[PDB]
Design a protein around this ligand. Structure first.
Ligand SMILES: OC[C@@]1(O)OC[C@H](O)[C@@H]1O
Ligand SMILES: OC[C@@]1(O)OC[C@H](O)[C@@H]1O
Ligand SMILES: OC[C@@]1(O)OC[C@H](O)[C@@H]1O
Ligand SMILES: OC[C@@]1(O)OC[C@H](O)[C@@H]1O
Ligand SMILES: [Mg+2]
Ligand SMILES: [Mg+2]
Ligand SMILES: [Mg+2]
Ligand SMILES: [Mg+2]
Ligand SMILES: [Mg+2]
Ligand SMILES: [Mg+2]
Ligand SMILES: [Mg+2]
Ligand SMILES: [Mg+2]
Lengths: 388, 388, 388, 388
């Protein structure tokens, strides 16, 4: 009935989101830069729980070790003044020209070593600030042409980089875990580990796989036309959903980073249903950009909308699942049977069961309707608040 | 100079490819059915190595155990008469109406048990015929709506099914391995395990993962806008490329199954370069459909073209890699450095190396061009046969 | 508050929609055929206004002239018994194998002449039944390969065909208009006139352009990733929206034909807002397929849902536009200024207006925010019924 | 045998192409700015015919009328020194923040008037420099959300703007024509007039349609998954191909602007075949970006490759069409029949021709194969230089 966020809703925002100045491939900035301190206070007033950062959002690139300490101390004061937390941090290995062919998988070996040292420096800072999750988006790991990158050698280099970071945090005794954020393309013509599946598969080849999970992003998987709730379910099934980036996207095109709820609204409904029913307990992090049409009042309006739309969808998904009429429809569509083992009786009892093959009435089974359209219209009526 | 296939090129075709009668969602068949025996002889004359089948391509559905033995015996005679092999087989768990909500992940438990028994029956037949690989394409495992399928429960059911098949073949002592073929959509609105990455990740959760790999298909990954040579490289890196389906696709749309070489021609070039340089030794299997515009002469013309275009691209990719001018360009673009470990000296020596951070000249590194456009035009000149 | 359709809502359905038996490229029919008479009565009971047909839906192909009259007479009795109307009809020039390379643009001239005679026969029948609109979907006009179709010659043939149909209806004195339905692909690899824009442009080259408009389909334009409300606005602007096909689609993939409201829900909201605010008065026609998972109860449930979701969205869009808070936000975002002429003062007064260039303060204009995010969240709150 | 361009090949480049500094949505510039004078001389040495510009590429924004004359005079000297021409020019109505909601269709009326005056100023300069074509790419005309733009009012404003520009050039007596360049998205979430078809349709509603054509761009239509040679054929058929932008694109994703020949190579082959067979006589203009991985030697290498790949494809397409074996295959596939009128005998003779319907043997027609696969493999062999 009310949709006001509280810090217990665990909503978080990156400094780079509300701080995006509006520069796009075809145009100049439309907004002035925001001081991180002002973003923290403004987000706290809207009901956020916390903020996240790349190293270069907080400390401008090339900063003297003394300008560094000043930047951190001011940030830390705003956090103390507001109650805001920093649950995640990440490294910028994509903006500076030295990263034009990648960080961890750049063809030049000296660049790969620099990327790792820049990363390690920021992990120390993240731990100091209490982050629990360290995200890695390899936005420049990839290629525009086929001969430029041997992908097996590049995966060797990627594995080597994450293995060294794992060695570092265990040797330091830090309680932080890594989350890889996949994206299929942009800014490289194809990016390595392009989807949640490719990232999950890669993690299983690392020396200490339990330290690594995924940070899927709504618009990223939709840039490949994939079903984001399905990919999150696979991640939850694997025990690897360590963090999540929420935003909106209208289909297969450039990464729009719209506010959450915009883009594919029904996919947002099913995503919230899944996160809340699985008991996901991490941050609900928004990685979005207020459109460059907006001034600063529109920036805060867009950020508030992220939170509002999550809380409306949560309410509607909870109402859906609690409705006795929906629970009966789920049984009518045999969702209860899907959850039962196919063959708990075992292989030999399955091979000897004539009711499973020799005497199975296929025509009778085929004729049973699944009743999925009635179930889906109940879900639509619940989403639109049109139940009677 | 010549592009004539021989059975040592290991080219294989499914019975359902040249046997496709032309029925599409909007139109009736344009060709009569082909007898499997005639396809085997015709393909042998074109230079193919072997054929593959679904159970229902070879033995019509509902066949009496005696009509079954007759169908197999005639097939076996054509194989003996021609020298053709059967390296792969698979199950049809998608055409009959009983599979309308899936085989292994159908919501109805009796259908899941039937799907497993239909599968086990055909694995026995495949082994008899000497297949080494058993493919599974879960074309109906998926959903058109969000509430119809709990994807975590469905992955539990999928895992249970593959685990039971693994138990079966090990208990029988068979030397056959499984290959999962991913597809993102069609005929379901979203299919589970939609890409090579999602399939690789799933395999790592099976009880005996060494028995399972992937069977990627060119057009399937391109239906998600992904780079097929990159996904095959990840599969090779994981040691899981057990089989491959070759065809062409023009972008993100329905699955066209064009002949190999059609669709994205440069991606075909880089795919052949990779398979030949990695020493892939399995079958080069074509899963394609001669367009329904064609009569039977056009069917055989289309099948021959599959093989011809593979052999032309092999020649051009070999010429590319053998060209001393290309080898120098690869060094100019530092492909040799990509293959060297980033930090064989180890974590502590990396942390103490001032040349990796405190004293790294980032501006000098950033200014080095990668020379990728010159390398890519050499690759284009080689593909087009325009070297001078 | 209630969402019950009445025939005054003008909802119509094709016989082929609820009558779809479930055959897809990978599977057999899951439902038995429906008699047209039974569909008319069932749709009338749900509150529909009318039905539409292809010639071959009503009269099976190759029917004797006497079996033809029997089929029509029974249909006509069901229409009289129910009050149902037939506002649109169309020709099937895509299912029979003779149309495998097209109807009006088939390379074989004898097929093009046959396609026109099959068409003319059905226009006479449509007029008899009182249809006002005759739709043409050239589903087989197109190509899978570049050399198979010279597109300039094919457009000449397409123009010739529509010009002859225009000559026919004017020479007969019939009051019927034509609507071309674009689709980008499927079942041909690329279809001619692939989008609403290409069809609008083509019409302007016909000899009697006032007889022709478009019949856009939601999922068709979304198969090219386009904004369907924007394309309908262009069609309305041109005075050419003669009919519309409503359904749902999840992105760029095969044509799903989901029920209306499914697929991209926010695009459905903006489409209904536009049709109702522009005063579109034609039929609201559903061209959809109940998924093949469903039995006949699910078919009728899916058809009812089409109508229900239109009436819910109509209510929400009307509430949006009537809200004084939204009307103020529209002014804040200068929608009122967009509707004023840029230069009613004329070219010379614009060239002499220093306030338009020499003395325009660009920095002050640039700094004004558009306030679009606040407006869009008001639209979201209205769609979800979350206004407070 | 040789692939060296000459200025008689009419190859042209925009100043912004080779001058692109490498700034993308995620990263800083990797190359220093180029002086226009140096680009003209470098392009002349590679064999180009001419260059094109936006006003702001040549004269930096806000320039004093005296700094303006200096910039133009230096440019004019480089043109005189090199023999280079300027066949096209265009306006930048997308980079400055004042254009964040559009130029001609911005909601603010004062911005629309400014956009027209900025445009008119540059048309005068273009004429002085001898351009024959004035391009308009409305990159900011569009929306990220549904309520922000009434598209009928925006098309009214767009029509008003182009009508005033037409009035201007006719009142001045200038011999210049306009070309509208469509793009479906990026940088706006959806752009108005998103495809060649929508632009062609819009032109027909202008007061003086003969002054306006299209400037299609390879990658733009492919961002909607459309067939670019088909859209160019429709433009040629309408008599509206006034200019063309050549580049490469790998599928539906952000606009990559790769060099021509990269991206979809077979579509490039069929495009060149069509332009050369239709006798297109305008500039072959490259609108591309050397990837930001490259230094200045890679920039010139990429530009040279544009020209080289056009000349290789021209040679291969000419060889295809001249091959007697291909000419026979075209007849076998009835391309000659496609070019004959369907019914030159007229409507009444068609209605009385029993051979067109009552006595047409549909089964015999249906059984004829189109032989398109053999024709397409001849085209593939010609493209790859594999004829024997
Ligand atoms: O770098 C981590 C990330 O989540 O922050 C923004 C960037 O686009 C990416 O998605
Ligand atoms: O069933 C296995 C498979 O490879 O055969 C054809 C089907 O489309 C699939 O791709
Ligand atoms: O034939 C006219 C039409 O509207 O009916 C169904 C077909 O798919 C098309 O969309
Ligand atoms: O502005 C005209 C244009 O052709 O120049 C570059 C821009 O992207 C557009 O395609
Ligand atoms: Mg993103
Ligand atoms: Mg992110
Ligand atoms: Mg396929
Ligand atoms: Mg396959
Ligand atoms: Mg459709
Ligand atoms: Mg339709
Ligand atoms: Mg472009
Ligand atoms: Mg352009």
């Amino acid at each position: 009935m009310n949709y006001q966020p509280t810090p217990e809703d665990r909503f978080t925002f990156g400094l780079w989101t509300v701080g995006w100045q509006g520069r796009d491939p075809f145009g100049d900035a439309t907004r002035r830069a925001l001081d991180p301190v002002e973003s923290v206070r403004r987000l706290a007033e809207l009901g956020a729980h916390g903020v996240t950062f790349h190293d270069d959002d907080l400390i401008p690139f090339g900063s003297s070790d003394s300008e560094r300490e000043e930047h951190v101390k001011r940030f830390r004061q705003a956090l103390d003044d507001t109650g805001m937390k920093v649950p995640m941090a990440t490294t910028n290995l994509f903006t500076h020209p030295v990263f034009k062919d990648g960080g961890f998988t750049a063809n030049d070996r000296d660049v790969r070593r620099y990327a790792l040292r820049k990363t390690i420096r920021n992990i120390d800072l993240a731990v100091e600030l209490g982050a629990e999750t360290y995200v890695a988006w390899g936005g420049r790991e990839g290629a525009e042409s086929g001969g430029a990158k041997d992908v097996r050698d590049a995966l060797d280099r990627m594995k080597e980089a994450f293995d060294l970071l794992g060695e570092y945090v265990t040797s330091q005794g830090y309680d932080i875990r890594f989350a890889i954020e996949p994206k299929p393309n942009e800014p490289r013509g194809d990016i390595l580990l392009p989807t949640v599946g490719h990232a999950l598969a890669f993690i299983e080849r690392l020396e200490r796989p339990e330290l690594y999970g995924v940070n899927p992003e709504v618009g990223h998987e939709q840039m490949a036309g994939l079903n984001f709730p399905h990919g999150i379910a696979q991640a939850l099934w694997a025990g690897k959903l360590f963090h999540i980036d929420l935003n909106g996207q209208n289909g297969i095109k450039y990464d729009q980073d719209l506010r959450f709820g915009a883009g594919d609204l029904r996919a947002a409904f099913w995503l919230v249903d899944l996160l809340e029913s699985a008991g996901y307990s991490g941050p609900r992090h928004f990685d979005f950009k207020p459109p460059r049409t907006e001034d600063f009042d529109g920036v805060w309006a867009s950020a508030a909308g992220c939170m509002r739309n999550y809380l409306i969808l949560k309410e509607r998904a909870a109402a859906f699942r609690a409705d006795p009429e929906v629970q009966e429809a789920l049984r009518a569509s045999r969702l209860d049977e899907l959850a039962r083992p196919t063959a708990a009786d075992g292989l030999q009892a399955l091979l000897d069961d004539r009711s499973a093959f020799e005497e199975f009435d296929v025509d009778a089974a085929a004729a049973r309707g699944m009743a999925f359209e009635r179930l889906d219209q109940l879900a639509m009526d619940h989403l639109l608040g049109a139940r009677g």
